[PDB]
Curated annotation (Swiss-Prot):
Protein name stated in the entry: LIM domain only protein 7
Full protein stretch here: 1037 to 1125 of 1683
Domain PDZ residues, every copy: 6-89
The species this protein was found in: Homo sapiens (Human)
Phosphoserine found at: 8
Expression (tissue specificity): Widely expressed. Isoform 2 and isoform 4 are predominantly expressed in brain.
Modification sites for Phosphothreonine: 12
């Protein structure tokens, strides 16, 4: 009932605004908590409750949230976020 998919989100490199979504930490997983109207994440059609599996070259693991957070900050710097998510039906 779940589908794996890849979602590409892009904005100006080094922008002062984030991509438009917040994360719900529900260890051992992380999920999309909110997607803001008007944002790059809404344009790209990321959805609330999508499970976040990886961003760019970083697979999430409950064992290293530090590297996760560093990968998220780096994607804000480059403006490119290719997300592997699992969407439950
Ligand atoms: Ni929910
Ligand atoms: Ni670029």
């Amino acid at each position: 009932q779940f589908s794996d998919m890849r979602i590409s989100i892009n904005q100006t490199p080094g922008k002062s605004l984030d991509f438009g979504f917040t994360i719900k930490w529900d260890i051992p997983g992380i999920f999309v908590a909110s997607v803001e109207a008007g944002s790059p994440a809404e344009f790209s059609q990321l959805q609330v409750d999508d499970e976040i599996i990886a961003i760019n070259n970083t697979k999430f693991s409950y064992n290293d949230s530090k590297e996760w957070e560093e990968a998220m900050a780096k994607a804000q710097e480059t403006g490119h976020l290719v997300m592997d998510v699992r969407r439950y039906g």
